[PDB]
Structures are given as C-alpha cells and as structure tokens.
Amino acid sequence: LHFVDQYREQLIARVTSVEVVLDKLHGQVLSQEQYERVLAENTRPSQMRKLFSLSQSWDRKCKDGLYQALKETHPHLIMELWEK
Amino acid sequence: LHFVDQYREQLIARVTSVEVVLDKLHGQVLSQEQYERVLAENTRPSQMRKLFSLSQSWDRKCKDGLYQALKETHPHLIMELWEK
Amino acid sequence: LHFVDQYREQLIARVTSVEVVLDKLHGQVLSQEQYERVLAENTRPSQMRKLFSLSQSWDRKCKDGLYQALKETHPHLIMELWEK
Amino acid sequence: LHFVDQYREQLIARVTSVEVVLDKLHGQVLSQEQYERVLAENTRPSQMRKLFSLSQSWDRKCKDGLYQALKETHPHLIMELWEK
Amino acid sequence: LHFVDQYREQLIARVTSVEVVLDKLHGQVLSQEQYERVLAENTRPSQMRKLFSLSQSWDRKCKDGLYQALKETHPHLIMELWEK
Amino acid sequence: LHFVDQYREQLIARVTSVEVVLDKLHGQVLSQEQYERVLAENTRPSQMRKLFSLSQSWDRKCKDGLYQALKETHPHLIMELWEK
Amino acid sequence: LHFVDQYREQLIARVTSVEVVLDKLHGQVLSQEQYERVLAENTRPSQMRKLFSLSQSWDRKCKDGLYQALKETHPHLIMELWEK
Amino acid sequence: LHFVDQYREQLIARVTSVEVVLDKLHGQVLSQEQYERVLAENTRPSQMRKLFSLSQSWDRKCKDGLYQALKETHPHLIMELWEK
Amino acid sequence: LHFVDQYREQLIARVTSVEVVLDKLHGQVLSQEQYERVLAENTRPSQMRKLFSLSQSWDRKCKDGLYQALKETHPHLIMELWEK
Amino acid sequence: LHFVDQYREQLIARVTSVEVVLDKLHGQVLSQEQYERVLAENTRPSQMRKLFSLSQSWDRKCKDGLYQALKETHPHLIMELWEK
Amino acid sequence: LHFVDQYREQLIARVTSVEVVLDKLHGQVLSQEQYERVLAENTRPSQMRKLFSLSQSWDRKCKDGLYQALKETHPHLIMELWEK
Amino acid sequence: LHFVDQYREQLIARVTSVEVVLDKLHGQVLSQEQYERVLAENTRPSQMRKLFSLSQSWDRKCKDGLYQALKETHPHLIMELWEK
C-alpha cells in the first residue's frame, strides 16, 4: 500500500497551490482532457477530490510521479505526514 | 437497538455536510463502488437516504464508526438528539 | 418561532456587508468548509441565500448568535424590522 | 377555470426572475422539500415546469397567491396576457 | 368505513410528496420489504396505488397512523376534502 | 382443532407478503418442488390458497411452524384474529 | 452440507453489491444467458433470490467459487455468520 | 480467445476516459442508436458494462478496433495487463 | 340492446387508458378481487377483454356506470361511435 | 390514410425537440396522465414511439392538430418529407 | 429452403438491436397487434424467438423482406453466416 | 457524404470560439430553445458535441450554412482538414 493511498483523507483538505502541482504532471501521466476537466469545480478542496477519482488507473510510475511533485512543491507538508 | 437505528427518521432531514462525513468512512467500511454510487442523487436529503439503505450489512464496528464521525462533525446535532 | 425564521424573505434582499457579518461566526457555529463554500455565488443576494440553506442544523445557540452579530453590524436595519 | 390554469403553456417560456418569485411563496403554500427540489433542473424553462407539476394540490388560496406574486414582480407580463 | 377507504379514488391523483409521507410510517406499520418495493413504479400516481394494495391488512392503528401523517404533511388537502 | 384450520377462509383474503412467509418455511417442512409450484398462480389470494391444499399431510410440527412465522411477520393480524 | 446451503435464508436479505459479486463468477461457472436474466428483477433482494434457483446443478467447484467471491467482497458479513 | 474476451473482468473497473474511447469508434462499427443509449447509466463503471453487452455481434474487425482504440488512449493500462 | 353490448368487438381494439377508466368503477359495481385480477394480462387489448367476460351478471346500474365513466374519460371516441 | 399514418417510420428517428412539441398539445387532445407518463422513457427516439401508440383513438381533429404543431416547430422537416 | 429457415438456432443468440429491425417491417408484413405483443418478453434473446413463431404464415415476400432488413442493419453478421 | 459528416471526430476536439460560430447561425437554421440549451455543458469540448446531436434534422441548407460559418471564422482549420 502506497503513501498517497493511505492518507488520502488528509491531503484533500490542505493542499493549496493546485495549479502549480497540476502543471508538472501534464506531459507524462494524463492527456489534455483530464487536465481541462479539473477547472469545472471552482473551489480548492473539490478540485483535488476529482483528481483522486483517477487513482483507479495509476500504477507505480504515476503514483511515484505524484509523490515526486508533491515533495518538490511542499517540503513541510509531506514531511509532516511522513513523520507520524 | 442502536442509537442510529431508532432516530433514523430525524437525521435524514437535517444533515448538511454530506461530503465531509462521507469522507472519513472511505478507507475501512465500504469499497469504492458504494462511494461512487452516492453522487447520483444530487440533493441533500436523497443522498443520505441511499446511505441508510446499506445498514443491512452493518455490525457494531460500522454503526459505532458512523456514530463516531457524526459526533466529530456536529457537536450540536448529535448532542441535541441525545438529550431527548 | 424565532425572529430570523419569520422575516427570512425580507433580509436576503437588503443586507450589504456580507463579508463582515460572515466574519464573526467563524469560530463557533460552522466549520471551515461551509465558510469557503459561500464564495461560489459571487452576488450579494445569492450568497446570503446559501447561508440560510444551513438553518436545518441550527439550534438556539446558533440562531441566537446570528441575531447577535446582525444586531452588532447594523443598528438601523434590525430595529426597522423589529418595529413592525 | 382560473387564469393561470388556461395560459399555462404561455408562461413557461417567458418567466425570467424565477428566484425572486419563488422566494415570496416560501412561508405558506409549500414546505422546505419542494423548495429545495427545484434546484435540480438548472435551466430557466425546466424549473417552472416542475413547479406547475404541483398544481394538482393547489386550491384557491394557493392559485390566488401565485397570481398575486406574479402580478407584483412583473407589471408588464401579467397585464400583457390579461389584455388578450 | 374510514376516511381513507371512501375517497381513495380522489387521493391517488393529488398526493405529491410521496417520499416524505412514506418516511414517517417506516418504524411501526410496515417492514423493510414493502418499503423497498414501492421504488419500482417511478411515477407519482402509480407509487401511491401500490401502497393502497396493502390496505387489506390494516386495522385502526395503521389507518389512523396514515391519516395522521397525511394531516401533518398537507394541512390544505385533508382540509379541502374533509369540508365536502 | 388448530388455530389455522378454523379461520382458513379468513387468512386467504388478507395475507399480503406471501413471499417472505413462504421463505422461512423452506428448510424444514417442505421440499423444493412445492416451493416452485407456487409461482404459477401469480395473484396474492390464489397463491395462499394453493399452500393450504397441502394441509392434508401436516402434523403439529408443521402447523406450529406456520403459526410461528405468521406471528413473526404480522404482529397486528394474528393478534386481530386471536382477540375475537 | 455446504455453508451456503444452510444459511440461505440469511444471505438473501443482506447482500447489497449484487453486481460486483455477480461479475467475478462470469468466466467459469455460468453462461451469458443466466447473467442477463438477473436484470429482470430490479430490486436488491429479488435478484439474489433468482441466483440460488440455479443451485440444482452446482457441484463443489461452483459452490466453493461462490463462497470465495462472497468472502472477497465482504470480509465482515461472511465472518459474522461464520462466528455463530 | 481474444485479449479483450479473457480479461473482461479486469477492464470494467479501471477505464476512466469513457467518452474519448467511445468517440473514435463512431464512424465504422456501430450506428447512432447504440451511441446514444450509453448515456443512460451515468456512472463510470456501469456505462462500460453496457458496451460489453454488444460483444455478441463482434468479429475480428470490431474486437481488433476496440483493442486498437484502447491501446491508443492509455499506453500504460493495456501494457500492464499484457505483461501478465 | 344496450350501447356497449352491440359494439363489443369495436371498443376492445381502441381503448387506451385502461387504468383510469378502471379506477372510477371501484367503489360500487365490482369488488376488490375482480379489480386485482385484471393486472394479470399485461397488454392493452387483452385487459379490456377480461372485463367484458363479466357482462353475464351486469344489470342497468352497472352498464350505465360503465358508459358514464367511458363518456367522462373520452369525449371523442364515444361520440365517434354514437354518430354511426 | 393521413400524412402522419404513412411516414410513421420516418419521424420516430429524427424528432429532436420532444418537449416543445409536447407542450402545445396539452390543453385539448390528451389529459394530464398521458402527459406525465411520457417522462418515463428518457431517450429522444423512444419517447415519440410511446406517443404513436395512442394513434388508435385519434380522429381528424387530433391527427390534424399534430401535423399543425409539427409544421409550426420545424418548417424544414415537414417540408422535406412532403416534397417526396 | 430459405436462408432464415436453416440458421434459426444461430440468429436467436446474436441479434442485439431488436427494436430497429422490428421497426422497418411495420408497414407491410405485420399488423399492429403482433408489433405490440413483442414488448412482453423484456429480454434480448427471448423477443426474437417469439418472432420466428410466426414463420408458419410467411411466404417469399415476407421472408425476403426480413432478410433484407437484417442485411441492412448489420452488414457483418449476415456476411459472417453466409460465408460458412 | 458531406465534409462535416466524415471528419466530425476531428472538429469536436479543436474548435475554440464557440460563441462567435454559434452567433451567425441564430436567425435561420435553429430556434430559440436549441440556442439556449447549449449553455448547460460548461466545457469547450462538450458543447460542440451537443450541437452535432442535431445533425439528424439538417439538410443541405443547414449543413452548408454551418460549413459557411466555420470557414468564415477560422481560415486555418477548415483549410487544414480539406488538404488531407
């Protein structure tokens, strides 16, 4: 069981800079359509929720990419959950 | 007879934050499918209704978990029903 | 029947300083999520409407708090309705 | 046969300010549930349609209330149909 | 002969809030199965019909309960028929 | 003379939940074939009739089981007949 | 006597996710026709009923498969019956 | 036995972009009606299910087309099943 | 010879709203049993046929009631046959 | 034989705005019940089908009215079929 | 011996779009009654079965029409059987 | 076969200025209702899709008008597809 799959209920309520963490994954994991659909929600918590709805088709390449981007953007949050 | 099973007709007309009380139960009690099916109703009273249709396969672990989450989200609602 | 519950059709069309009456209620009655969700409407009449959708889970503590904040912000409006 | 019951096919294609004419009827004719259900349609013509589905249980008090509110909101439309 | 048993042909064409009048009877008169079977019809007039098919096993407790809930939900319909 | 053997003309005109009272008796009193044959009638009064056609080979075990299941499903009907 | 053959009256009133437990058995035990026929019932308790009507041609391979799928989908229900 | 016909139980729980894989097949294999009927389900897992109900009249052209489109949309999923 | 008794082969091929013309006759002419039996046919032409099988025990009250209800529901068909 | 009765197989595959062509016919030809039943189909081609099942009791007023409404909504379709 | 009369057991297990192949035959070969009766089955394989029960009164016009419509809707199935 | 009807899968993923190509077609081909319904989608790819659902009732006048407006708005895209 991966790191993101266990604390999923914790992250969806605290990540703020949705746009800059959405940017880095554009070229590899997801196509154009999935990038566009996220703009429909128009609230910080809801958007992230929709993203985790696509966790059904992630394998280790894609989950590991997500953990990579989330460690590069915030060195205080990922640290804070990993300590527990 | 448990607390939730007797006053069931009272809660389905008053619970507001459907999403945040659905969030906490994801990882343990129910699978992904039951989590997705609830989005179909698209009205605050109806959604909760569908959830109580699954009370057929709950035992004390699950009823006690739900009572726990409802005590954590509203410290005024559960209080108000427990007084009566 | 409380004061706010009777003239509800009167208030939603005249309250101007939505932000400063939303501020005082933050710490006690409602959580973070309901505070954020109100930003979706983006019009003075619509926003207040959404707030009154949550009156289903208010008891005397919360209704009385709202009456309190509305008396502190506008000493001309609440008086004007109370005279009639 | 009342005024609203005869020209029903005419009104459902022209009424614009659905929200403010729905507001005035809240306290007397319909309960909370019917007030909430109308938000499901999300199109100006469809919503009013659903409202007329409740004409089955209106009597003269309620039809007269509806004609009253529709005369108070638009002094050009109700006049325009009554002339014919 | 009870009130519900004589004007049965009048009610099946006018009751709108099927769901909220079905809710109140859940705990005492009927079991879970009859509560679920009503969802099969999926039209306002048809559903109520099926309910009256169970009038064969009602005695005064159950007829009186139904009359009670229908007086509590609509104070205009029961009034309007009782006057005649 | 047993309870069911005397009011045989009374029950066949009032029992509604045929399926759930047929269910409980499956494992002990009757075999699979008689369970299947009852589906041929396709009417609430007729089906029950067919069941009583097997009263020729019941002894106290089976009649007592039937009275048991019918008291468990309807606590209002069996009471209502036993009072008289 | 197998596990499913004794507590059959217990399962038909509690299994909720009919579709996802019907899925796993598709490839080996039953053909396409029996898979399609189950859609006719359109109620959670009834559908499951029809499945057990095919228990006439099951041997240990098929009963063991069904017990397998029901243990994989719900680790709380099969446990709760196995304890008694 | 083809690739899609063996791992059918694997795909129906993981395919995300239903719309864009439905789009490419329009012009050749299926008519307009089958394209329209898929909108009824309104849930990610259910929709795809209905599509596989038409596998009765596919031959190598049509199955091969489906494998082609599913390889073009997700270069990570089809890989992941083909490795095993 | 009455009106309905002469054109018996004409009506059984054209009456559509069987249910709403069956409703009006419930309270006086026919009992509950005959009302329930009609649901067995499940086709518009066949149902009416069964009703005319009971013309053996009709007198003028009941035939006149039937002609009354069919004139009240359809003002175009009864006219069209009466002209000829 | 009327225009609508001959080309019936052509229209049922092309009429799009079911709602606005259903609106105009409400007041004269059909009652409320038939107006409500049409919402059950929930697909553009199927709905029209059900409507044509009622052509059994139409005379020249009703068929001619339908041809009128269909000429008022689409001045391009009725023209296109009438040319042939 | 015609084509349809030889592969009768082959077609009844593979034809999917029952409705659109039933549509084209309406105007010439069969009347309204047989067109309505097919709706009773409510399963894809069974419906077609009933159709072939009318093969007792087909001559070359009607068999040739059915083969025509079945070649027009599916250009892959008729091909696949004709090759063998 | 027209130009738009063959490369329809190409256009639905690239057209940007929905509003200005919807404007020019207002007065002739489609009525007010179809113009209003398109606002429901609220995503650039989805909207155009809905428009192509009305291709069932276009003839050469309307398809030719659509091709005209799309050639007038973008002199780079229509050229780009016509070259292939």
Author numbering:
A (entry chain K), B (entry chain A), C (entry chain L), D (entry chain D), E (entry chain C), F (entry chain B), ...: 1379 to 1462
Please quote the paper that reports this structure.
Many NLR proteins nucleate the “inflammasome”—a large macromolecular complex that triggers inflammatory cell death and cytokine secretion in response to microbial or danger-associated ligands. Inflammasome sensor NLRs can be grouped into two categories based on their DDs: PYRIN domain (PYD) and caspase activation and recruitment domain (CARD), both domains were found to form filamentous complexes to initiate the inflammasome formation.
NLRP1-CARD filaments are relatively flexible and adopt multiple helical organizations in vitro, as evidenced by heterogeneous 2D and 3D classes observed during structural analysis using RELION 3.0. Trimming of the last eight a.a. (1466–1473) helped stabilize the homogenous form of NLRP1-CARD single filament. This conformation was subsequently verified to be a signaling-competent confirmation based on functional experiments using 293T-ASC-GFP cells (see below). Importantly, the resolved CARD filament density fits snugly into the lower resolution model of NLRP1-FIINDUPA-CARD filament based on negative stain EM, matching the shape and dimensions of the inner layer almost perfectly. In the NLRP1-CARD complex, two positively charged histidine residues (His1454 and His1452) extend from the Type IIb surface and interact with negatively charged residues, Asp1437 and Ser1435 on the Type IIa surface. In other words, NLRP1-CARD uses the HPH motif on its Type IIb surface to preferentially engage ASC-CARD and disfavor CASP1-CARD.
